[PDB]
Design a protein around this ligand. Sequence first.
Ligand code: 2BA
Ligand code: 2BA
Ligand code: BR
Ligand code: BR
Ligand code: BR
Lengths: 350, 346, 171
Amino acid sequence: TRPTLREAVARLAPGTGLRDGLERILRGRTGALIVLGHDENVEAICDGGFSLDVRYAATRLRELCKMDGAVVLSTDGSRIVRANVQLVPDPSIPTDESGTRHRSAERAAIQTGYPVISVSHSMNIVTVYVRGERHVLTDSATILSRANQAIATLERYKTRLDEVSRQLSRAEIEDFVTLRDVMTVVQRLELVRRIGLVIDYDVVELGTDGRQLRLQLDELLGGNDTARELIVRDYHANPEPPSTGQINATLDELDALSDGDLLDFTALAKVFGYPTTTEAQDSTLSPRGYRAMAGIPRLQFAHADLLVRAFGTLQGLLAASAGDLQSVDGIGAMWARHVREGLSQLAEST
Amino acid sequence: PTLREAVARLAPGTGLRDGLERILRGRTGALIVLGHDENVEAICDGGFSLDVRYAATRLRELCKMDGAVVLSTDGSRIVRANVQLVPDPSIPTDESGTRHRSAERAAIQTGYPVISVSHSMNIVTVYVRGERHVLTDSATILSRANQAIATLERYKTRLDEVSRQLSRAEIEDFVTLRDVMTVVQRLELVRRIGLVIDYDVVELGTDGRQLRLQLDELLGGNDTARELIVRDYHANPEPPSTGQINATLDELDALSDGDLLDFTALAKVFGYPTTTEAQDSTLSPRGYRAMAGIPRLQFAHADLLVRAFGTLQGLLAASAGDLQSGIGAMWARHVREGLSQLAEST
Amino acid sequence: RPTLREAVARLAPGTGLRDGLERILRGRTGALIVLGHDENVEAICDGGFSLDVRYAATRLRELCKMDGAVVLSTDGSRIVRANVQLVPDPSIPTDESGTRHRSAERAAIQTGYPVISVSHSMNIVTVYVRGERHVLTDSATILSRANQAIATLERYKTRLDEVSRQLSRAE
Ligand SMILES: Nc1ncnc2c1ncn2[C@@H]1O[C@@H]2COP(=O)(O)O[C@H]3[C@@H](O)[C@H](n4cnc5c(N)ncnc54)O[C@@H]3COP(=O)(O)O[C@H]2[C@H]1O
Ligand SMILES: Nc1ncnc2c1ncn2[C@@H]1O[C@@H]2COP(=O)(O)O[C@H]3[C@@H](O)[C@H](n4cnc5c(N)ncnc54)O[C@@H]3COP(=O)(O)O[C@H]2[C@H]1O
Ligand SMILES: [Br-]
Ligand SMILES: [Br-]
Ligand SMILES: [Br-]
């Protein structure tokens, strides 16, 4: 049940007691070497030092780290057990680290199974070792600059997504949609998602410092998963409306594609089920109407799903009379007038 | 004084903050008492007695000497310097270090604020009645507040879209509970993000006045909108009193950020069922919002008409003479034209 | 209650304590040490850390890198506490300067035990014993003083030989 690397980095994320202590250590320029566990195996490699039983605090961690040596914490992290200790792990344990402190850190994490942090006195750099794996913490200021650059590109990817999405809707009304038109929106939908994943990683590392960025990212992305779901159900090559499993499977195959493959429209076609040939890109497609219904304001997907499965195509849905929509079981009178008005208003703009 | 009130006294643009920034560049550290009275003199040891006007330069130089500087309550004078604070050790504190424990303990006993600039951490911390706030560089606060202003602009764009949808549905007489809870949710988010940006602006002092201008435009009109949405769609059949409206708005503020998401929780506050079927149910607005949109309409006049006709769909349908039936006919002609113009624009 | 002159002997070169203080001086850390532990001293001590370790010169330096004061047992064979904040009664009067040194003398007066204070800014060791104050002097300076006296003793020895020879002849 030893902790994983990703689990350990969370323990050092902003807003935690450990991270508060490490920030004090960094401002003190003392350097440090911390062991996040204590048992018989850890004590076997711990030399001399001091044996103390004190409650953990960020200030207490800094003061004990003013002394040369290593501080050891209990497994639960609630107590500081030892300070000034000399770690003496088995030298046979391999490590490609530099310096006595950092090489001792990796060897110690490997032998005991617990994480070990090493703050460089000369470089003010925090590094955590867990089972031969290494992750370097980054100051929240640098991460925020990375995420704000990505937010700028995400805003532009949303602007281009909106322009090509509007173009596809206009083509759906005129019934001259091509596969190239759909795969143009598919590419932009995925690019928005991928930049979103980049920013999400930056948000997690920011801990409490990323709460403000969490709001900005969730609003800009918001509705992207709905859009990717709607384009798949509207334009999947399989004639019958896709099952809930089939939609998720197609979206997963899209995520599996490389960044270089997203630029290839033919690769995007394979995921939907169309041929990879250049002639297929020019081919006409007939939308089912899922996207058009979603455009209608205040229309829940449950209502639109019955109508799209019933009428089959966006052109039986458009030509429908308000009474025809009502016949479908589960569609109320009032909703039939609202949908018939919605499709008519879509025809006026385009 | 409250903690946040004290932060304004240490905020950029004030004399104290100028002095504290001087102290930070010197790496001297400091320990300052923001008050002087008979009780404070009892805990001040030795030191020097001086009567000079406060200045940023005077505060830095006096803080080069080990010990503490004491200022008068109004901050216009420096009373003593180099003092060794000796507060009662019985006073408990969860601080670490001799300087900082003396700061928190001293603030508690005297009742005045006590600032402590750490030499080892180059960090300013102010204590007020057992409370702790660490000053933050204006650059970090500005980045937080500008992301929040961007998010607030985006929240206003969504607020306008869902707000237009509700009014247009009011004309069409097909309002659902979900339509109302969408506007209620979006209104609260503008409120809460606005309060966050407000605190950052206060801490920013003179650097945040420009953000205050941007913030005051984005918020403006939010309090009126929350009041009117409660009047039109409160579950109690009788039009809610001002006391009931304010109680509903307070209960909204009491909800957590997670509850503002859940539409069913918002329904509970208004008095509707928490079930999903209730969210789909049709609701009929009272018409207070529509009448308020009509120019030159008194709230008392619109309140009489709303109590009589009940809904926005009896106000529209009512003939001009029906509105006068007791109300001034001249106003009745103005109400029918105003209601018709709203239907044409939507 | 050892006397002040007795305390200086405990801090004289060649002792364990003096080895630790010389480490502290080379480190420029400063320190505040209490050479005794009883129930009354603990009454004046705050949080800090509680350790039961044998004294060593190296061990004393590292604990004195942390802010606060370290407390030793009466005989000095064990170290009881580190990072402690002694808070003696401010009523005890002293015209000392700085929070550490005035706190040092007040602590020695109240407890009756010696308390050493090494100044970070001046690299000066001062010991307080029952309201008395003595500043230690580096062995280099004392040796220069004592060699001046040895020169005067040799010249006084020659002068003694001349007057003694003069007296014997007169006898
Ligand atoms: N076996 C060895 N082989 C080669 N060189 C050796 C060595 N042992 C020590 N040194 C050298 O001595 C420097 C200072 O050692 P010190 O223990 O004073 O200062 C140490 C000690 O406070 C701590 N540290 C390093 N390894 C440690 C360990 N295994 N356990 C506890 N603390 C450790 O990190 C400090 C800085 O280490 P850094 O490597 O930068 O600097 C080291 C390194 O250059
Ligand atoms: N009663 C006591 N018990 C244990 N250790 C004691 C002590 N009094 C002083 N020290 C130790 O001496 C250090 C230096 O004190 P100094 O007087 O040079 O310089 C002091 C002094 O100018 C100021 N300071 C702390 N407490 C104060 C107080 N109550 N009144 C005025 N100034 C205070 O903060 C400076 C740095 O304090 P810091 O804690 O960083 O570091 C302290 C602490 O390690
Ligand atoms: Br290093
Ligand atoms: Br400090
Ligand atoms: Br000093």
